[PDB]
C-alpha cells in the first residue's frame, strides 16, 4: 500500500506531495486515517531540524483524530476496532519492558520513547503508531478541536497530576497563548483559584472569561512581589526568559514552580529561595497513555475544548506559516480533505 | 458560490449553506471575512422574533475583514483591494432622500438596509454598499474590532447627540456587553463616569473598565441621593427598572437615553420632564461617518471591547454560549475553513 503525505525534503523547506510504502503492517502497529490534525510549534522545530535528529523526507504531524483502519496481528484484541475513533500524540513507540515502561509509565522509557513524526506522523492520509499509544476517545468528544489535547493539553494536564492539584489549590499560569489558555481552562473546570501572568494584563480580560480569577503583568515587579508565599503552584508555559526569581518567591511553603516551557536559558534557582521556602522547581512535557486517555475523558465530560481554528490539510503550507507567524488563535487543526 | 452558515427555520441551529450571489452590483464591495463578532441581534433575527426573518437566513453583522473585489462604481471610492475593512448592523441606504444626502444614511427613508436581511458575516465572505464597508486605522487591533461596529456605534452615538466632553457627569445602567464599551470610551473621553450595577461582586472589575463611582442599582436610596447630579444616563438594558430615579438623578437640561429595546414602553411623567427641562431618548447604530470616527477614536485612544473567541466552525457553540447569557462581554468568531 502506499501513504499519502505531505513531506519537507530539506530542512526548513516546504511541504510537498510525497507518497510512501509504509510496507506491512507490524503486529503492535495501527493503522489510522486521518480526519483532523494540529499543529504547533514542534512539529515546525522538526521540519526546521532545530534539534538536529530530522531525517528527510520528513511527515510531520503529532496531534491526530482520526480512525482505526487496520490493527497488526498482536493488536487485534487490544481494545481496538476498525473503524473506531482515535487519537495519535507525540509520542508512538516505548519498549515496554524497562521499569518506565512496565511500571505504566511509558512516556519515561529508559531507551527514549519514539516520536510519531520519526516513524511519519499525520501530515498525511494515514499514519502507524504502536496500540499503546493509539488513544480511545469517549463517544460524545468534540472531534473537531480535541486533536491539540493530545499534545498540548496533556502537557499541561501532566502537572495537575504531578503536583496533586485540587479544587482548594492555588495556582499561577505564566503566558496565555496556546498552552496558557488550555491551562487556564482545564484549572477553572477543577475549580481551582487561577491567576494569569501575561504581557498585556488591559488587552486581556479576555483571559478572566477563559477562567482565570485574576490577571497580573508577568514583568510588573511590585504586583509580583505582593504575591510572595501566595501559590500552590506556579506553572510556566513560555519559552522565553523572564526574571524567574520573582516566582519563586510567590511559591507558599512547600510550593512548586513547573515549567512546560523549554526555555533556552537555563533557571537561575538561589538554594537559599529553596530552603527558605521548601520551594521545588520541575518540569514535564507529554504524558503517558493512560493520562492521555484519562484527560480526553476529562476535557469531553467537562466540555473543556482548545480554541481553534480550521485549515483544509491541501492548503498546509499556509497553515504552517500562520503558526510560524505567531497569527494561531490559538491551536492550528488541519482538516483531511 | 459563497459558503455560509445558515438558520433554516426559525430558530434552527446552523448548517453549511451555499448560495450565489449573482455579480458583484456596480456600487457593492466584496469583502472577505477574518472575524465577525455575534450579538443579540443575530440571535433575534436567526429566532425571527420580528416576524421578518426569511430563511435560508445568514446573520453576522459585526465584521472585521479584507476587501477582495470592487464594483465598477466602487473603484474609486478610497477603498482598496486588500484593505482591512468593517461592516456592521447596515448593508445599504437609498442614496437620495433627505437622510441619505443629508449624511444621515442610517435614518434613511426607506429603511436602512440591515447586513443580515443582505446576507451577513457568518459566512467566507459577503457584500455591502461601499458607503456601508467602514475603512479601519492601521494600528486597531482587528481581533477584537467587530463589535465596535455595533457595540461601539451604539454607546458612542448618544454621546454625539448629546454633545457629551470630559466635563460631563454620565451615568451607564447595565455592565454587560453594551455598558462595559460605553464605559471605556466614556474613560477615554475624561467624563466623570458612574456605572449603576446589579452585581455588588463586579464592582473592582466595573471600576478597573473606567469607571469612577459604581452604584448598586438594586439599592432605590442609593439612587435617591444622586438627584440632579448628572447630565446624560445612558440605559444599556432591555429590561424593565423603575427610571424614575434616573429621571430625578438628571440635572436641569439633562438627558436619559436608552440603547436598551425595552418592550414595556417607559413611564415618563410630564411633570418630571417639565419640572428639570429634561428629555427622554433613543438611538441605535450609526451613519457611515460616525462609524469612521468612532473606529479612529477607539484605535487611538485603545479602546476594545472584552471579548470571547471561537472559530467560525464552531458557531453553533457560539452561539448557544450568548444564548445562555455567558458571554463576557462579547463573542467574536474568528473565521476558518468552511466545509
Ligand atoms: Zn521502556
Ligand atoms: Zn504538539
Ligand atoms: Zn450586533
Ligand atoms: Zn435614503
Not at 42 to 53: A, H
Amino acid at each position: 500500500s502506499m501513504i499519502k503525505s505531505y513531506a519537507a525534503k530539506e530542512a526548513g523547506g516546504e511541504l510537498e506531495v510525497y507518497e510512501y510504502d509504509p510496507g506491512e503492517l507490524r503486529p503492535q502497529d495501527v493503522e489510522v486515517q486521518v480526519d483532523y490534525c494540529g499543529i504547533c510549534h514542534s512539529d515546525l522545530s522538526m521540519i526546521d531540524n532545530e534539534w538536529g535528529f530530522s531525517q528527510y523526507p520528513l511527515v510531520a504531524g503529532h496531534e491526530v483524530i482520526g480512525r482505526v483502519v487496520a490493527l497488526g496481528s498482536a493488536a487485534q484484541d487490544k481494545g481496538l476496532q476498525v473503524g473506531q475513533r482515535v487519537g495519535i500524540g507525540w509520542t508512538a513507540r516505548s519498549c515496554g519492558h524497562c521499569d518506565a515502561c512496565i511500571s505504566g509509565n511509558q512516556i519515561n522509557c529508559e531507551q527514549g520513547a519514539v516520536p510519531t513524526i520519526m516513524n511519519r506522523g499525520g501530515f498525511a492520509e494515514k499514519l502507524r503508531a504502536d496500540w499503546q499509544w493509539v488513544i480511545p476517545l469517549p463517544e460524545n468528544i468534540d472531534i473537531e478541536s480535541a486533536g491539540p489535547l493530545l499534545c498540548g493539553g496533556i502537557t499541561v494536564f501532566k502537572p495537575l497530576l504531578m503536583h496533586h492539584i485540587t479544587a482548594t489549590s492555588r495556582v499561577g499560569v505564566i503566558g496565555i497563548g496556546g498552552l496558557g489558555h488550555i491551562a487556564i481552562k482545564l484549572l477553572h473546570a477543577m475549580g481551582c483559584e487561577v491567576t494569569a501572568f501575561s504581557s498585556n494584563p488591559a488587552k486581556e480580560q479576555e483571559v478572566l472569561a477563559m477562567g482565570a480569577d485574576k490577571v497580573v503583568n508577568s514583568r510588573d515587579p511590585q504586583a509580583l512581589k505582593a504575591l510572595a508565599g501566595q501559590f500552590d503552584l506556579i506553572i510556566n508555559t513560555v519559552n522565553v526568559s523572564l526574571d524567574w526569581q520573582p516566582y519563586f518567591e510567590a511559591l507558599t511553603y512547600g510550593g512548586n514552580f513547573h515549567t512546560v516551557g523549554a526555555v533556552l536559558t537555563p533557571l537561575s534557582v538561589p538554594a537559599f529561595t529553596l530552603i527558605a521556602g521548601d520551594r521545588s522547581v520541575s518540569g514535564s512535557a507529554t504524558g503517558t497513555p493512560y493520562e492521555l486517555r484519562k484527560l480526553m475523558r476529562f476535557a469531553a465530560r467537562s466540555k473543556v475544548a482548545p480554541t481553534t481554528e480550521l485549515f483544509p490539510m491541501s492548503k498546509i503550507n499556509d497553515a504552517i506559516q500562520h503558526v510560524r507567524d505567531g497569527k494561531a488563535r490559538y491551536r492550528v487543526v488541519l482538516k483531511a480533505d
